[PDB]
Symmetry: C3
Subunit: 597 residues, 3 copies
């Protein structure tokens, strides 16, 4: 009677309890207290209610779904996935997540505390999957929201090492969906060939979604995998902090990016990356602009550590038939980034910043401006010819560089022939320090290679900190690049032996609102006159020069050339020196040529 | 007999347990294991011990207080506020928190894990309240400390949307009191009209208090609300990290600040703000200097993202009859900040840094120095006339600006008439990049408007990066501003067409220890002499000029003006050019005027 | 019968339970649910299974070890150390941790949630100890790994205040061993005289180990203690974030460092330090290079707040018979650091950066390069003569300084006599702001004191922001320092009254590839000639000068000196001025001397 009730499932509901024997505390039953927590064990049972042990040959999916569905029905809670066990998933979910190749459906206010391990069984080999899906509809546009869903703990999600079956397939760990106040904290995602580990939001719908203190380990493994971004941030007021990302496959060096920031007010901070092609995309895709507008603004990449093989930050924006995307108000700061040991040209072109074309290769759709790149370090090994502070491959409406340290082959680069970007407001402050690792490697190359259609309202203040006499020039403009309302200077330090410092193939430095200064060697010849006497340049290509001054000592006693020069209508320089004794003088002098500065 | 004991409240204390059947484990009873945790359910009961369900019509306050008081009596623990329920509070607390309009009294070592929702009932409508109070006395000065108290979880505190009843009232979420090692992590505070969500410390008493990963949503809603700072940090070695703050009301744009840092060794990092008037106050109030001294030092605002309507960082210090407050050793870095879309003058004057007067409007009490503002971005839309890198409205003893990007109407500003601050050690390094969003908007305005009583030991190195010919001047000193032992330079780039570059209305640039350089147009006339021949300025206002040099080309063949000039006692410039053929020459030239540089 | 089973230890395993009466949930027993968690109470029992109360006279060690060992046997879990109790440890462990003076042995996948207090009993007074040890062997080289071990909670580890018995002894809180994915979060370590609180890794073996939100309070207390680094990071992909470190003893000001970063891809962020000698070591020790290679790279110290008495960041690398250590790719950024109030020379020499000799004092073994120091603030009080931006005491292969604010006695320093470092690639950008706290204190001192064997490929761009006429020179090279392929400039602002600006005791500024500019006063005398007329310097020590220009006004009406000068073979300067009326002129002028700039 009483014995029977006690051994029944209702037994615990008949045993009284009062907290610490406190007479002022609730008189409850044991079952009530045990009902304050919930684990997968409370649903991991056969139809008669007997517990099932997890393992390689047990598909845990329906049991976890039942737990989620039930806790959802009570307004939420946290389900623990117990430590000490590996819980295998072995079949697809059903309903609104089947269109997403979903395994488990997440539900609002239902948190998962993953302390044990979740493993994918070989049912998923060569197939698509998205392990945790927060959509409730096959069509994301008719999906409801996922709110207040947190996954956390010390546990693991293991994708079982299976390769993709076909490049067209997609694979994900956590697809939060149209997600609001959702997060992943503490979890290790490992051992896969996937497209993403976590995606946050859906085409701008969502808010307040975060990935923190997670580890992502070896999540690309095959030539079949088309592309990878480990965390894809597709809702605003969201981001990634204090994570670790590591890949070891060769394929990852060519296709994988750690983070993609695709909506406004998003961030990527304090994370360490190794073995990836790319650091972060920061891109406003017009096809993803439904939920939070057409502008990506307030984008922050800060205080990360990366060894990569391709590009650290990739900026973009694009358009559709009905929507134009814009990118502005970005800060990239405090990051320390290297291109890993590799042969030149063996992975995508190495870059700290890349201004990339759209997915169809168009370089004339972008609207990127008000970007600040400051207080970062970049290094590439001396053999990596394809390394640049910025590869400027598409139209740019502004990017400002202050107080960085760049130590790679090029400072500014774009390939000739290719795209001919239209450039406005590119600012390279004199406080950017140009390293010398690539000294002596730059035969035939221009340090700032300005292979653009045009440059306007831009500043390039070149300052070397060691010699590199192998380079063709410090900065070169082809004749095809228009240049106006710009300031281009080359500091003389470490330049005395350079044949070419600044080169303007179309004589663009003569423009009315071009402000330039650079060293040049000039031959001069004086009149015979004893006393104050003019010296004039033998060459006539200085009609643009507003002043020039001596960078050379005067080895002579009997005369001195002018310290300073102006020009004449015929393009000669002229200055007044001094003949202590008369005679025609002929000298070769290093001058700082200046125009309007 | 046995049946009776088992169904009694002591029943669980009669059922044996040994962990996982391990014979080396303690032989315990069920009640002992259940006593390892505690929830509000263990106290949320009527006088007969029957559990009460929470809800809109149940006042949960006495039950939560009883739980806190009891756990306190045992040396501490963590009380869980269960998920899946909304727990309403409906009356004020009693005792030492009644003077603070307290609801719940916090106690040392007693943590709250808020997984469910705490809601305020309409009893609090139009009234003051402070939901959680750590003071044990009505008079904070005779209060004991609160130590080792942490509030955390995925839950919510909802202030029920009630407006303030009167501007004089105060409202708070968590008043920690004289708090040591206390924190709030993970909680969402929403739906209110309050003064603060969380306050840390009391007039410098406290230490090691933090707010992390909390969200603060819509916490100002009425014209009645006098003021708001979401987190007020009033103890040292304390701060705010990785939080989200969002307001939507119009009133918030005029009164709300996200954080106030009021004691030394405090920080505000990695947080995102939207819809606020202000970012952070960083202020040493002499009236709050009892617990940690008279100095606010080691103040850090870093790596935040903000869209605001007024000022990002507001610096101050003030005095009382017996105490003077000082502010020094501050760093503001890596932040990306915008003034939101708004009409000019429709909210408090937009600023990245504001040096504010005291609460009584006094601008002659402040002692603010050794501030570093570096590697930040600031943007204001082109129509916002009231936008400045710094509004310098009170005495300043030092502020240093390096490697920022400011894109707004003014760089340095203070309104004329108003306060006449005394300025020392203002440093504006050439590495600050001046954006061009406000180009063409600056009719009648000075980019650096130096409306001060005096400027000493200061550096302004102005560098433009595009043209703006609408501005009256790059920098202007009224005749009322003394200027000494200072360096003021205007780079020539994008200045060739400017009528005025630097303006010194009192001819202050002639001071003995003033070091200045800027472009000017000058008319000159030569002697008739063939050969080396002097040119002299027609105007006599260059007695302060130590050298000048040509910024113009020479369109002539038969002569050249001097490349470089010095002056004469009468205030003319003079240099030696060259007449190939003789004749009096008359030319108009753009020169860089220099004094002691 | 049934009564007997129920009161036995197996009783709970006979009482049925089904979660919330849900008929689809597992039919379990109470014991199963209680077995989901585990605490120290489940092992803190006598041999008959009766629970023992912890306290001062109970040694809790064997019971905690038994708990750890058992949970380990089940594949892991989290053991809670209950709140409300102090758990004393009173004897050493046995087995593989005895060689490490271990107390408790940590085991893989076994987490400790420390909510209560762990205290050391006086058995440990005057003895060595390491409280938690992750090694399983006395010899670390034959030790197995510790993986997936996390210690966290709101609890405390108290070292009981005992002094060290002898300087040779070692003491530690948590020695993780060869540790992979291990962490400490939330814990307060206090009240000791120890060598370290936490060590991560062993001679480069380990990965993904972190210390977050921990507090470290008063952990050095005696003159006996040889040395202290609070967190020692000796494995890669590891670091310290958001911690608090505080010492109050005088001894700590001379021996204690907060963090030591000893392997690649390690970081120290967002932490606050007070009362320590040092901030962080960043050092590649060749004796510790077994597990992760010979290079420390990707080292990050960012956004910390410190008041220290010695040096903030200390860089090093050294060698053994068979291994050479290298240090490169380091970033030190956003930190705000002060030397605390102290007498000059009363603690180790104050420095923001120190390039230190090896432990045997050798300054010729180091290979340190590609370091970026940017956007930091440093302050030392005016009386602290021993304060420097960088003490450069050992060979340096590169360090770059951009956009810092340094306000201390020296900018660059090394003591004369002592080491004679070989310096390459030291870069001091003009954007570093030199504060004026030490103005008037620098009698007999050189601001940049270049006491080196040699300097190559280096840049020193000195910019003052106030006067300090007490200093002997802005920069001085002794004749013993070679200088080549370098750029050394002194901006003229605030220098007009300085006798010496740049000093080159060996006339090193004449070198072929030395690029220098600085102010000097020069006496000149003209010829008699009316009209354009040469002026020449009376002194002949300007054979290295390529140009010079006037920094002085001309008080004369009847003549003007040249605005600009070049030199002559005999070392005189010469320029062409203008005599309106003839006569020999004699003037004393302030010039900017330039060489190849
Ligand atoms: Na073109
Ligand atoms: Na005045
Ligand atoms: Na030497």
């Amino acid at each position: 009677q009483f014995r029977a009730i006690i051994e029944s499932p209702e037994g615990a509901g008949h045993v009284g309890y009062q907290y610490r024997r406190n007479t002022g505390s609730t008189m409850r039953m044991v079952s009530d207290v045990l009902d304050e927590r919930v684990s997968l064990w409370d649903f991991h049972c056969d139809p008669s209610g007997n517990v099932i042990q997890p393992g390689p040959n047990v598909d845990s999916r329906q049991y976890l779904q039942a737990a989620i569905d039930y806790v959802s029905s009570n307004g939420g809670g946290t389900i623990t996935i117990p430590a000490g066990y590996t819980w295998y998933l072995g079949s697809y979910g059903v309903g609104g997540i089947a269109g997403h190749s979903g395994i488990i459906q997440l539900r609002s206010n239902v948190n998962l505390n993953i302390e044990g391990r979740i493993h994918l069984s070989p049912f998923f080999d060569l197939k698509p999957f998205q392990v945790f899906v927060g959509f409730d509809n096959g069509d994301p546009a008719s999906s409801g929201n996922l709110e207040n869903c947190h996954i956390y703990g010390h546990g693991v999600v293991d994708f079982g090492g299976y390769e993709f079956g076909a490049s067209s397939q997609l694979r994900n760990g956590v697809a939060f969906g149209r997600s609001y106040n959702c997060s992943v904290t503490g979890i290790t995602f490992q051992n896969g060939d996937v497209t993403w580990a976590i995606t946050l939001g859906w085409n701008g719908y969502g808010s307040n979604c975060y990935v923190r203190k997670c580890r992502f380990i070896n999540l690309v493994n095959s030539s079949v995998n088309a592309d990878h971004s480990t965390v894809y941030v597709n809702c605003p007021y969201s981001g990634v902090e204090s994570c670790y990302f590591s890949m070891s496959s060769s394929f990852a060096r060519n296709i994988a990016c750690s983070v993609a920031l695709h909506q406004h007010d998003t961030f990527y901070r304090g994370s360490t990356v190794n073995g990836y092609c790319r650091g972060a995309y920061v891109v406003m895709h017009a096809a993803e602009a439904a939920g939070a507008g057409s502008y990506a603004y307030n984008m922050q990449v800060e205080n990360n550590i990366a060894v990569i093989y391709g590009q650290f930050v990739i900026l973009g924006s694009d358009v559709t038939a009905t929507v134009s995307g814009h990118l502005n108000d970005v800060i990239v700061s405090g990051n320390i980034v290297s291109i890993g040991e590799r042969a030149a040209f063996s992975a995508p072109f190495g870059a700290f910043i890349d201004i990339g074309p759209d997915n169809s290769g168009a370089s004339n759709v972008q609207d990127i401006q008000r970007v600040l790149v400051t207080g970062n370090s970049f290094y590439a090994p001396a053999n990596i010819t394809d390394s640049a502070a910025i590869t400027l491959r598409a139209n740019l409406n502004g990017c400002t560089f202050i107080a960085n340290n760049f130590d790679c082959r090029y400072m500014v680069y774009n390939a000739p022939g290719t795209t001919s970007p239209v450039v406005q407001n590119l600012v390279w402050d004199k406080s950017n320090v140009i390293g010398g690792t690539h000294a002596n490697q730059r035969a035939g190359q221009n340090l700032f290679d300005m292979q653009f259609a045009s440059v306007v309202n831009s500043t390039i203040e070149v300052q070397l900190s060691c010699e590199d006499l192998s380079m063709f020039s410090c900065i070169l403009f082809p004749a095809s690049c228009q240049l106006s309302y710009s300031k281009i200077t080359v500091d003389s330090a470490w330049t005395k032996s350079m044949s070419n410092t600044a080169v303007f193939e179309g004589n663009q430095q003569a423009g009315a609102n071009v402000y330039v200064s650079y060293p040049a060697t000039v031959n001069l010849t004086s009149y015979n006159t004893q006393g104050a006497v003019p010296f004039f340049s033998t060459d006539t290509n200085y009609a643009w020069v507003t002043s020039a001054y001596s960078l050379s000592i005067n080895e002579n006693l009997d005369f001195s050339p002018p310290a300073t020069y102006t020009n004449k209508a015929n393009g000669q320089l002229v200055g007044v020196g001094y003949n202590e004794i008369g005679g025609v003088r002929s000298v070769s002098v290093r001058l700082m040529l200046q125009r309007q500065v």
